[PDB]
Design a protein around this nucleic acid. Structure first.
Ligand SMILES: [Mg+2]
Ligand SMILES: [Mg+2]
Ligand SMILES: [Mg+2]
Ligand SMILES: [Mg+2]
Ligand SMILES: [Mg+2]
Ligand SMILES: [Mg+2]
Ligand SMILES: [Mg+2]
Ligand SMILES: [Mg+2]
Ligand SMILES: [Mg+2]
Ligand SMILES: [Mg+2]
Ligand SMILES: [Mg+2]
Ligand SMILES: [Mg+2]
Ligand SMILES: [Mg+2]
Ligand SMILES: [Mg+2]
Ligand SMILES: [Mg+2]
Ligand SMILES: [Mg+2]
Ligand SMILES: [Mg+2]
Ligand SMILES: [Mg+2]
Ligand SMILES: [Mg+2]
Ligand SMILES: [Mg+2]
Ligand SMILES: [Mg+2]
Ligand SMILES: [Mg+2]
Ligand SMILES: [Mg+2]
Ligand SMILES: [Mg+2]
Ligand SMILES: [Mg+2]
Ligand SMILES: [Mg+2]
Ligand SMILES: [Mg+2]
Ligand SMILES: [Mg+2]
Ligand SMILES: [Mg+2]
Ligand SMILES: [Mg+2]
Lengths: 181, 81, 25, 118, 66
RNA sequence: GGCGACACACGUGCUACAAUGCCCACUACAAAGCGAUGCCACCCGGCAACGGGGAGCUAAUCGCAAAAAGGUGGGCCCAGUUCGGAUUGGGGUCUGCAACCCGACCCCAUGAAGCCGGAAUCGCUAGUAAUCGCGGAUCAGCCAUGCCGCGGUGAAUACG
RNA sequence: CGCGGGGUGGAGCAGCCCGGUAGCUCGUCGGGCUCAUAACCCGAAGGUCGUCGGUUCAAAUCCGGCCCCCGCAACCA
RNA sequence: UCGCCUCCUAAAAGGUAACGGAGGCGCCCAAAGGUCCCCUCAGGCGGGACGGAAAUCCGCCGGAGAGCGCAAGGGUAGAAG
């Protein structure tokens, strides 16, 4: 679907606010938002390669994409880890499917997080992308809670064309990202 | 606890109410650890007694409902080894 | 059991009275 | 279904299944049951999403609970320590706060025993 | 997207302490969300319900009347 | 102020680990002792501790008093749980010149170890052992689970 | 100098060979039995593997240097 | 100690001794082979639940210091990885 409420909210009322604030000679110079990369690192399923495809089934359900699997770069002794094995799932979502996911994340998921006095605002990476991570997977609407065998969280990479943190913050703020200020 | 109550020994309650309207305030040593503290105690430095000597205790506003002896410990420990 | 002061058994054992063993007859 | 925080109770009884929340039990349970006017002998398994929303919305709103409660008891203790007070030292050193006796069994608050020689 | 191997992702409706989020466009249409914060209970749309800090406040208050 | 200390070690005990059990309601049956510087019916306020009031008793003459287990009914459905209530947070009550060190009690929250205990080891031969409650001395109050007593129910087993 | 073996809880000895895991007796500590000690029983603690380097994902283990130990040898002159 | 490979000695062709200085081989791989197509390292800094010097993820910087089954050399990402 090409409609998707947040996409809109970005175009009508997020873009202009940004042009009003920083002020921009070019339509392109104003920050767009590409690539939410979701990544589950799991040493948890290492010797068990079965547990994994459940986690990928879970990730599919909330993303609408099947993740691909990442495999161990080098071999490390101290926690098991032959250089062969699967460490975790990683899904790239952009372009619509991205949007429909961030919407759900803003209006349902984070709200459901126990505590949550808001998203940490130091996680901006200095060139203006943002990262965060979640402890449990059941904070999502598509997860039924009786389909959790074991908790696994993840890492989320919000990538943005904004050259700086400040602008990147502004973009995401205006989209409705709740921040701990 | 008490309530119809809030007991404070008149010894220091004197010299404290005194150190409010004098305009000057300094170091005051009481044996009264049974008393309660504040509001006009705050900012003052009182030396409470543990049975052995008088220990200076700086008075701030979350020390409020507490007796003075709470900030002047009677025993000496530092563990066994 | 006799040590739960929040019950009839506790209160009796401790000899006391309250919401969990109110005095009536 | 789930009340404050996540805390899903289930099956069992309802007025019992309410204990399983941090901050609530016995009394506070039997209370919110007639102040939302719900049968306590009913089982959380089955009941109207109606009596479910009345129930969540009451509890979550009346008193503070798992997240903010824990953090509030947390903060009290922090205050007791670092103010320098005597209840504070016994939190600092992991020892019993209210009278009692440490020459012998404090175990609950001292840990397992750590034996030494004679 | 490679055809096979995939959740449908069809338009939905969805629920909360609030009304519906028409947005949806998710797998598995008709979902029920326990509560959100936005929809403005519980933090955003700051309610500050149940509110804390009372414990420095209290010790000074019932205190000096007695 | 300390005798109340706490890395630890021992003795005597209380409470348990549950369904011959826990909870709530209703409903029975004791004895011995204490009390007009005290015991306090009954009414009211309070969820309650308790606080107002306030009659009777120098006491087989009024009070402590409810005995508890039991009985009946209902609930819990084998779960670290309606088991178990240690710890801790907050809120109060009473005594007392005063409850920080060091009080007892009520309420809200918190709910720990514990699923019958290694080697070892104690008591008990009948109205006993188990188990259930009650009074008193000391005493302002109380760390009593102690002690000295009172009755309720009430086994097993001794070839030798 | 030369060739061969060794260095691991307090003591004595395995494990090294064949990379991943450090065990055995005794001592030590806490309980028990005894009037008491020993014997005896029930529990526990304790080693970074001489050392410095290297190899590997990983070194007590494989490799090199150095330091001690024990043994053998040092003949025709 | 004795055959074989790498480096130095070796005096800028080749070659060149010593009981000169240092290391390796006596295998291995049905994919670690042929071809076509694609992809590009290590490291550092910043961000990210369990994740720690390091598992996985995201950003920038990083002409090769990585990789090329094993020693060393030469070579090599305009690929041999
Ligand atoms: Mg930053
Ligand atoms: Mg950017
Ligand atoms: Mg109980
Ligand atoms: Mg004594
Ligand atoms: Mg003490
Ligand atoms: Mg006892
Ligand atoms: Mg356990
Ligand atoms: Mg005290
Ligand atoms: Mg059981
Ligand atoms: Mg026993
Ligand atoms: Mg007494
Ligand atoms: Mg008694
Ligand atoms: Mg011994
Ligand atoms: Mg002996
Ligand atoms: Mg060596
Ligand atoms: Mg190494
Ligand atoms: Mg000869
Ligand atoms: Mg000769
Ligand atoms: Mg000569
Ligand atoms: Mg060269
Ligand atoms: Mg040459
Ligand atoms: Mg030449
Ligand atoms: Mg030449
Ligand atoms: Mg050789
Ligand atoms: Mg890198
Ligand atoms: Mg980093
Ligand atoms: Mg190279
Ligand atoms: Mg080479
Ligand atoms: Mg090489
Ligand atoms: Mg080379």
């Amino acid at each position: 679907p090409l409609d998707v409420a947040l996409k809109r909210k970005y175009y009508e009322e997020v873009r202009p606010e940004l042009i009003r604030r920083f002020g921009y000679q070019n339509v392109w110079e104003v920050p767009r938002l590409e690539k939410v990369v979701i990544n589950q690192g799991l040493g948890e399923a290492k010797e068990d390669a079965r547990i994994l495809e459940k986690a990928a089934q879970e990730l599919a359900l909330i993303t609408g994409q099947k993740p691909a699997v990442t495999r161990a770069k080098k071999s490390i002794s101290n926690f098991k880890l032959r250089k062969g094995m699967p460490i975790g799932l990683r899904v790239t979502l952009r372009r619509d499917r991205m949007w429909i996911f961030l919407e759900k994340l803003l209006n349902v998921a984070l709200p459901r997080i126990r505590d949550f006095r808001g998203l940490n605002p130091n996680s901006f990476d200095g060139r203006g992308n943002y990262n965060l991570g979640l402890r449990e997977q059941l904070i999502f609407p598509e997860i039924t809670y009786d389909m959790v065998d074991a908790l696994r969280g993840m890492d989320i990479a919000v990538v943005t064309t904004a050259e700086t943190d400040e602008e990147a913050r502004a973009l995401l703020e205006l989209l409705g990202f709740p921040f701990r200020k | 606890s008490l309530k119809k109550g809030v007991f404070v020994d008149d010894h220091l309650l004197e010299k404290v109410l005194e150190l409010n309207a004098k305009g000057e305030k300094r170091l005051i040593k009481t044996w009264s650890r049974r008393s309660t503290i504040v509001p006009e105690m705050v900012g003052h430095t009182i030396a409470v007694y543990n049975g052995k000597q008088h220990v200076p205790v700086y008075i701030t506003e979350n020390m409020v409902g507490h007796k003075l002896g709470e900030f002047a410990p009677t025993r000496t420990y530092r563990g066994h080894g | 059991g006799k040590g739960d002061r929040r019950t009839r058994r506790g209160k009796i054992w401790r000899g006391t009275y309250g919401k969990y063993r109110p005095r009536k007859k | 279904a789930r009340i404050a925080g996540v805390e899903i109770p289930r099956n069992k009884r309802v007025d019992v299944a309410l204990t399983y929340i941090y901050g609530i039990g016995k009394a506070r349970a039997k209370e919110a049951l007639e102040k939302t006017g719900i049968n306590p002998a009913t089982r959380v398994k089955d009941l109207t999403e109606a009596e479910v929303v009345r129930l969540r919305e009451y509890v979550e709103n009346t008193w503070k609970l798992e997240g903010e409660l824990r953090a509030e008891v947390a903060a009290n203790i922090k205050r007791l320590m670092d103010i320098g007070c005597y209840r504070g030292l016994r939190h600092r050193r992991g020892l019993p706060v209210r009278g009692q006796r440490t020459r012998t069994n404090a175990r609950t608050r001292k840990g397992p025993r750590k034996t030494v020689a004679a | 997207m490679k055809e096979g191997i995939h959740p449908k992702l069809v338009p939905a409706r969805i629920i909360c302490g609030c009304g519906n989020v028409i947005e949806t466009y998710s797998t598995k249409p008709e979902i029920y969300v326990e509560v959100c914060s936005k929809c403005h209970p519980f933090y955003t749309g700051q309610q500050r319900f149940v509110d804390t800090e009372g414990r420095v406040e209290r010790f000074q208050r019932r205190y000096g009347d007695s």
